[PDB]
């Protein structure tokens, strides 16, 4: 009843392959504050959905998405509800804006009872991925009540700078990804560690170059960094924040295991039908989608699917469906949400192009076949980053998808949000 997590025994969904269009996307970007004007880019988006609530974030800057002057950073929370016509909508209820919008980077949100806790990086040198050596590690926490109050002190909004971070042997750590999970009173955020390339142990014999003629054995190791001679390598994982502790907040870094290892990239961890799932973006030579059931969270190990149908666009070195080790840092973030564990079928958006960020398709797929899909825009639509999150409305599976697009109507690079019901039958 109402809007709930994807748990229990949902209504049935079509598990057969069909080339008919049976998915019917909707625009729901309206009850949100993305109010358009040209000259601006709206970048660094974030979407999270948990227990009938949501977190959202973006950075609006004037001019270039890269070099433009930052104007406003939004971190908002609200409810996911039925308008009355059995279609889920998003209603912002509590919005936080920092005083300096150029300093917040790489936010990540996880929900726990009364709040969304969103963990961000504070930087005075731009993106720490690009200014890794210049970035002094500074992490902040913005905690937002999903249902604010009137005379509640700092119950509504609470900003707090983290001083105690256990990073192990990594020089610094950072949130990297849109959303994470709770386990009891312990929160886990998708994150990344910066390791000096000098103390990175990696047997080059592990690099899988069998029947990969033009691939050398070093390529794996060299691809663990933003480029072949980067000072750091990036190792994905989790940042753990245990709410039961009390005292000065401690975050603790948990590196991801080295099976199907690829360069640290924006990832996300979420619960589906009882159990945690991990998606890691393929920013490297391993361009087939990286997702799977979490075996253990701490230490973090992931049973990656052997998916042979979903990939991501790249560039001339590591384009779509590339599978041989190369030295590259290319690709996009396009996550997927487990909606049926028995058949392991997932829902998500991919970019139907080999070397260009365009043509976003919402697809329901299994490991070796796409069951069904629908384009979300036109053939040539510039689109890059997609965040898909599914849930239940009156026990029917719905997915909300954030897609970062070029909007032609206002000539603005911006996020748009789509709601897709997953149909019961395979035939109209």
């Amino acid at each position, epitope marked *: 009843q109402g809007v709930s997590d994807l748990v229990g025994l949902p209504n049935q969904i079509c598990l057969q392959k069909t080339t008919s269009t049976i998915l019917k996307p909707r625009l729901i970007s309206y009850t949100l504050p993305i109010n358009t004007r040209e000259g601006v*880019c709206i970048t660094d988006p974030l979407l999270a959905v948990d227990n009938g609530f949501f977190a959202y974030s973006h950075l609006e800057k004037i001019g*270039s*998405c*890269t070099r433009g002057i930052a104007k406003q950073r939004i971190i908002g929370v609200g409810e996911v509800l039925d308008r009355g016509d059995k279609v889920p909508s998003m209603f912002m209820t509590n919005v936080w804006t920092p005083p300096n919008p150029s300093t917040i980077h790489h936010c990540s949100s996880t929900y726990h009872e009364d709040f969304y806790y969103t963990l961000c990086a504070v930087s005075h040198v731009g993106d720490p991925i690009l200014n890794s050596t210049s970035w002094t590690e500074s992490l902040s926490l913005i905690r937002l009540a999903v249902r604010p109050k009137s005379d509640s002190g700092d119950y509504n909004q609470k900003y707090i700078a983290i001083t105690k971070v256990e990073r192990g042997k990594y020089d610094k750590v950072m949130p990297y990804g849109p959303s994470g999970i709770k386990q009891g009173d312990t929160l886990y955020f998708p994150a990344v560690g910066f390791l000096p390339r000098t103390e990175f142990q990696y047997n080059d014999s592990n690099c899988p170059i069998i029947h990969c003629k033009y691939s050398k054995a070093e390529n794996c190791r060299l691809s663990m960094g933003v480029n072949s001679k980067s000072h750091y390598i990036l190792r994905s994982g989790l940042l753990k924040y245990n709410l039961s502790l009390g005292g000065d907040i401690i975050l603790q870094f948990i590196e991801i295991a080295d099976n199907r290892l690829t360069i640290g990239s924006p990832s996300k961890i979420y619960n589906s039908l009882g159990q945690p799932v991990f998606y890691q973006a393929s920013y490297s030579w391993d361009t087939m989608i990286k997702l799977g059931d979490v075996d253990t969270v701490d230490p973090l190990r992931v049973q990656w699917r052997n998916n042979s149908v979903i990939s991501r666009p790249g*560039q001339s070195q590591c384009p779509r469906f590339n599978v041989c080790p190369e030295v590259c*840092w290319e*690709g996009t973030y396009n996550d997927a949400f487990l909606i049926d564990r028995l058949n392991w079928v997932s829902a998500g958006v991919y970019l139907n192009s080999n*070397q260009t*960020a365009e043509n976003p398709v919402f697809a329901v797929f299994k490991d070796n076949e796409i069951l069904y899909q629908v384009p979300l825009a036109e053939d040539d639509t*510039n689109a890059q980053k997609t965040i898909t999150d599914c849930f239940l409305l009156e026990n029917v599976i719905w997915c909300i998808s954030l897609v970062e697009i070029y909007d032609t109507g206002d000539s603005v690079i911006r996020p748009k949000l789509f709601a897709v019901k997953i149909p019961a039958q395979c035939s109209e």
Partner: antibody
Amino acid sequence: EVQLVQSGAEVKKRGSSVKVSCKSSGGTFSNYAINWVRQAPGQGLEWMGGIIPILGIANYAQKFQGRVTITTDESTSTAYMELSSLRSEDTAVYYCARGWGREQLAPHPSQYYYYYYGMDVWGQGTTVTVSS
Amino acid sequence: EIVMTQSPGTPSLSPGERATLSCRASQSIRSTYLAWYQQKPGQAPRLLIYGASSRATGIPDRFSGSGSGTDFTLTISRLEPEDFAVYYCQQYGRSPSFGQGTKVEIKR
């Protein structure tokens, strides 16, 4: 109505450098792109590069990467193209032209792509001779 | 990086007549990213076509664009004294490139 005005014809030594001006008469550079095209005497046109001032981005063809700096001055509504280490092969006429330019999303974690469109407003051209 | 080849190089044909000049890319390209320019004797070029079929601000209706994929075509309906000039095709976008040019001579 707007048209562009370029600097005067120049003669320069082999190894020297040139900085050709191109100023907007009617209005600012507001959101358009300024491309730089060159024509060797008796030959065809080759795109050297372009700039989009409202974004603060310049892009160049590979053949001229490193040798060419396309700069602006929005106080003076004026773009500049500087070529360096002039070889006899750079004796040519250099036009500045104006068309639309758009920033686009790229399949890269940080990079953006920049698209230079058809050029509809042309400067008169600036002849550059290089000879010892 | 994309290479444009034009043809013919030096066509000779008579005034008042129709003309068709071909441009071909070493790559398949979207039609949106193609232009036709005209350079009259000893002066600046001017834009005829963009998006492979559209005449610009202030252009006579003689000029017509065609083609897609890898093959493109400019068409002059009624040739006229000023219509004898050099014609360049341009693929534009990330790294624009011109063809070597087609110069329409006078037939006599």
